[PDB]
Structure formats: C-alpha cells, structure tokens
C-alpha cells in the first residue's frame with residue numbers, strides 16, 4: 413500500500429451512480445489544478461479527478477473506493493460482481509486500450525480534454541484524428 417494510489421495519466425475504471433464501470437484517466441482539475449484531495453478534509457475520504465473516455469468530454473471527482481486500476485476490457489466482468497450508452501462505452505474502451513500501450517507523457521498529450529475557461533472540449537489531436 414501507497415497513500416497516493418494514482419497519479420495524472422493513470423488509467424482507471426470509475427464507478428458513478430447510474431452508470432456502469434467506465435474507462436477513465438486521472439487528470440488535473442481545470443480550476444484547482446490538483447488531481448487529488450480529501451472531501452471535507454477527512455483523511456479517509458480521498459478523491460481523485462478523472463476524465464471519462466468515450467463520446468463527449470466529461471470529468472468528475474471520484475472517491476478512491478470507486479476507482480480500480482485499468483488493465484484491460486477483460487476486467488469488466490469481475491468488476492460488475494443499453495443503446496447509446498453501450499456505443500459510448502465501447503468507444504471509450506477502444507480509446508483506453510490505445511492509451512494503455514502509450515507512455516504516460518504521450519497519453520496525457522493525446523487524450524487530456526481541452527480546457528477553455530470552465531468549458532471542457534475535445535483534445536485538438538483527437539479532434540484532428542477523427543476528421544472534425
């Protein structure tokens with residue numbers, strides 16, 4: 413055990429209420445510039461900031477007990493124990509599996525969402541790759 417389980421660029425599965433376990437990457441919050449913090453300053457309530465792979469940019473502060481290191485798509489079955497949501501999730505898994513073969517510096521440069529004030533936008537490199 414380590415007190416700081418994840419760092420910026422780490423790939424993780426995150427669990428948010430109403431959604432299945434989703435592929436993510438730990439990242440710095442646009443406003444705070446931090447990637448980890450204690451909710452209400454309780455040492456047992458550590459959270460990490462993550463961005464979700466998939467269709468549209470999304471991010472969240474998540475409790476460390478709702479995160480699991482991402483090794484691969486095959487973990488999903490053991491972790492558990494829908495139309496538009498399924499296609500978004502599949503797209504996210506393809507991106508996460510591509511990011512897993514990259515170095516941490518390359519995966520941060522390619523996948524980190526573009527921050528324009530408090531608006532989250534596609535990474536210009538991902539946008540160019542998709543022909544946007």
Ligand SMILES: CNC(=O)[C@@H]1CCCN1c1nc(C)cc(N(C)C[C@H]2CCS(=O)(=O)C2)n1
Pocket residue numbers: 428431434464465466467468469470471472500501504
């Ligand atoms: C883009 N956001 C959304 O689809 C929805 C509606 C607003 C909040 N939200 C949301 N918030 C959170 C915190 C997570 C989350 N997911 C896990 C699903 C999305 C991840 C990126 S995706 O592939 O586009 C689908 N979804």
